[PDB]
Amino acid sequence: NEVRIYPVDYNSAPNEKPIKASDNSILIDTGSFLNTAITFDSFAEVPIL
């Protein structure tokens, strides 16, 4: 489990084209796109037997 939260339209020059698949989902968002983003890890953990 992991989350990576990055700004959108950050350090992205206008007219940039974000690559996408046939589903139209934005595989690579414009800008830093996780190059400068927060990495949420370790949602939790509990002692195990």
């Binding site: 350090n11 020059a13 007219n15 940039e16 084209k17 690559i19 800008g31």
Partner: protein
């Protein structure tokens, strides 16, 4: 490469290219050899493994490869045998492009397994060529707006 340069205040990404390998065959490292018959439920039977000698490198462990769909079915079939499952060492999702289809060999066990396969004694994986990540100099100039 000279040092005569003036700093550019504003810079932003212009073009993005992505190169990926969709196919992901499931690798399988197992010290126990599945070719040999497993022991019955009450009484087990293990005989270790043999040396594959893949890519000029040899080790006792055995390597199997199977598609994503068949792996869970194979796990379900082998649920009866806990000791063999405990023996599995490492599982890796190698891309499909590297491994030649021909190099794979089918293997038959005591039970009926759908699509278990094993690498040959001596074979070499392909080289993953990159084609999308190729930009000529003129394209760089055009992106610089200086043609």
């Amino acid at each position: 490469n000279n040092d005569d340069v003036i700093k550019a205040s504003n810079k932003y990404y212009l073009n993005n290219y992505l190169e990926q390998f969709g196919g992901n065959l499931v690798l399988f490292q197992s010290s126990a050899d599945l070719s040999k018959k497993f022991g019955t439920k009450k009484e087990p039977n293990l005989e270790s493994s043999k040396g594959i000698t893949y890519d000029y490198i040899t080790s006792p462990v055995n390597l199997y490869v199977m598609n994503r769909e068949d792996f869970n079915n194979f796990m379900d079939k082998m649920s009866k045998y806990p000791w063999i499952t405990q023996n599995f060492q490492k599982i890796i999702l190698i891309p499909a492009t590297f491994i030649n289809k021909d190099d794979l060999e089918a293997v038959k066990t005591q039970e009926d397994i759908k699509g278990l396969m094993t690498l040959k004694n001596d074979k070499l994986s392909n080289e993953w060529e990159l084609k999308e990540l190729r930009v000529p100099f003129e394209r760089l100039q055009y992106m610089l707006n200086s043609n």
